[PDB]
Structure 1
């Protein structure tokens, strides 16, 4: 089975580029990462940074997670993310997404050894 670490990389890591190429980015990436397969995943953030820079967040500012757990970390620096958000008119199997590009702090949940992102909590 896929590790929580490996699932975080499939869902949230796009080291290819450094930002959204067009506004078809989400429609292609949500597809290529198997996020439109069972259902249309409604909201998903891709981080356009190196694995090393996103994993280092786990040594940065310790914060509460949305669920009340305290294994969350806020990045000290802003990071290049694409927010992917299903349109109101999107219907499975033809999933449609709005692509928003931004530079923001990420909050991730970390666990295991090595201590690495397992959950994308939010961008701030």
Structure 2
């Protein structure tokens, strides 16, 4: 299949790029293949900037692990949230643009993002 790092890029990175954004992106990145992923976040910053977060503010992960890092500066992100009318395979999403600090979990050598934990 793919590596944890590759999966993170597929699920959360969009350095390139509306109200239909999430509906298209969640489908394009295969996040609605088996079921409708409840929520997801896309980061519009460069891969370098996001990877750099692994050496920024160390914070506790939501699950209790200690390998999470928070960005020192806010980042342009888009939050995707499944609607009520949404019914698989026709997953409907609410697109919300925002500028917040991101928190990602990092692992490996090279030490890179493998999980999007939260946006604050």
Structure 1 stretches of 4+ with a deviation exceeding 3 A read: none
Residue 33 (structure 2) aligned to one of 27, 34, 37: 37
In the other structure, the counterpart of 2:4 is 4
Other structure's SS at 1:28 match: helix
The answer for unaligned runs of 5 or more in structure 2 is none
Note the C-alpha offset of 1:91.
0.2
Aligned residues: 120
TM-score by length of 1: 0.95
Query: How big is each residue's C-alpha offset from its partner over 1:6-63, in whole Å with a ceiling of 9 and x where there is no partner?
Result: 000000000112xxxx110000000000011100001000000100000000000000
Note the C-alpha offset of 1:89.
1.2
Query: How big is each residue's C-alpha offset from its partner over 1:60-103, in whole Å with a ceiling of 9 and x where there is no partner?
Result: 00000001000000000000000000001100000000000000
Residue 53 (structure 1) aligned to one of 44, 49, 63: 49
TM-score by length of 2: 0.99
